[PDB]
């Protein structure tokens, strides 16, 4: 308990002043990637050095970086928290519990519009 | 007089529930009183929407103890 909660993570004082009010609330440790990938826009997910650049801002790196970052992957893992995507050459790849998408599918590709044939199309009903 | 896509209502419902098992079913039918389809045949086509949503595989069903329905997106 001591070198879990109280000797060891003694440095969120010494590092950690950032949770107060006025906004500009600095999330507490259960809860960093979350905003980081809440606030995301790739396909695969959130990748360890993407994690490093959005945490890089003003929170302590110490030995957490190295030991605890995936521990607590691990154990939100063990607690159903978070999912992540199989790949190679992605660089990873992150995902928090979010209900926005289908839980399962046989595979498939997405895809995007660009309004060219809009303006030209306006004209046809217009036509005939 | 409008009338929104029928697809998307109950994407919308659990998206909005914001509930732990999940949403019942007559939390999408009190979810769905706007201006929409009187509802004389929910029953059976909701029934048939999930029917088919299903077999796309964009719905969830678990068993519990708590609402009358547990259906998750």
Known sequence: MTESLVLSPAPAKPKRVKASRRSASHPT???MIAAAIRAEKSRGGSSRQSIQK???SH???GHNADLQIKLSIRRLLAAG???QTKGVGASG???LAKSDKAKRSPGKKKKAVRRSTSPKK???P???
């Open 93 to 95: 790849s992150f995902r």
């Open 59 to 61: 929170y302590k790196v």
């Open 126 to 128: 217009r036509k005939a």
């Open 29 to 31: 440790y259960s809860e």
């Open 54 to 56: 959005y945490i890089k």
């Open 81 to 83: 928290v978070l999912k």
């Open 122 to 124: 306006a004209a046809r």
